[PDB]
C-alpha cells in the first residue's frame, strides 16, 4: 500500500546489532536490532553490508567456527 | 625481521580476496590475495575490517554454513 510502514533502514534508526540471519527467500537477510528500539526487523544483507559494514562483520566474528 | 618490509597492506596493493585465516598468534589474521600479485600475505583481521570491509564480508559470506 501507498502508506506502508517504513521498514529496516528506511525507518532512519541507527543499527545496533544483528540478532540472526536467514536466506529463506533466496536472498540473505539479517534480523536487525536498532538503537533504542525494541522492534527488530529484517533487512537485506547487501543493504547492511553497505550501510553498516562493521555491524555485519561483528555478527560474523561472533560466529567463527574452526572446522580444522 | 626488521628488513621484511613492506608486507601486507604496506605493499600498497588492492585487496582482491581473502583466501584463508589463522588464529595461531591469539589475534585473528587473514591470508589476503592482492589484485595482480601471486604472493598472498597475512594481515590482521582488525586492519582488514578497517581497510577493506567488503572483502572481509565477502569472505565470511562465502563460508557461512547452516546447521541442522
Amino acid at each position: 500500500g501507498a502508506a506502508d510502514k517504513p521498514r529496516g533502514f528506511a525507518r532512519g534508526l541507527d543499527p545496533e546489532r544483528i540478532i540472526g540471519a536467514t536466506d529463506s527467500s533466496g536472498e540473505l537477510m539479517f534480523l536487525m536490532k536498532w538503537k533504542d528500539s525494541d522492534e527488530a526487523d529484517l533487512v537485506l544483507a547487501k543493504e547492511a553490508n553497505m550501510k553498516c559494514p562493521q555491524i555485519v562483520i561483528a555478527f560474523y566474528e561472533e560466529r567463527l567456527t574452526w572446522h580444522s | 625481521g626488521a628488513a621484511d618490509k613492506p608486507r601486507g597492506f604496506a605493499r600498497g596493493l588492492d585487496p582482491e580476496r581473502i583466501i584463508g585465516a589463522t588464529d595461531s598468534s591469539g589475534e585473528l589474521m587473514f591470508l589476503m590475495k592482492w589484485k595482480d600479485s601471486d604472493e598472498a600475505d597475512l594481515v590482521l583481521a582488525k586492519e582488514a575490517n578497517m581497510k577493506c570491509p567488503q572483502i572481509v564480508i565477502a569472505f565470511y559470506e562465502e563460508r557461512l554454513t547452516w546447521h541442522s
Binding site: 540478532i19 540472526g20 540471519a21 536467514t22 534480523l31 527488530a40 529484517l42 560474523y60 560466529r63 567463527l64 567456527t65 574452526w66 572446522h67 580444522s68 | 584463508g20 585465516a21 589463522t22 588464529d23 595461531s24 591470508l31 565470511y60 563460508r63 557461512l64 554454513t65 547452516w66 546447521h67 541442522s68
Partner: peptide, 15 residues
C-alpha cells in the same frame, strides 16, 4: 516472522 537459523562461518586453521 522473526525466526532465524543456526549458522556459522566455517573456517579452517592454516597452521
Amino acid at each position: 516472522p522473526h525466526r532465524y537459523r543456526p549458522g556459522t562461518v566455517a573456517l579452517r586453521e592454516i597452521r
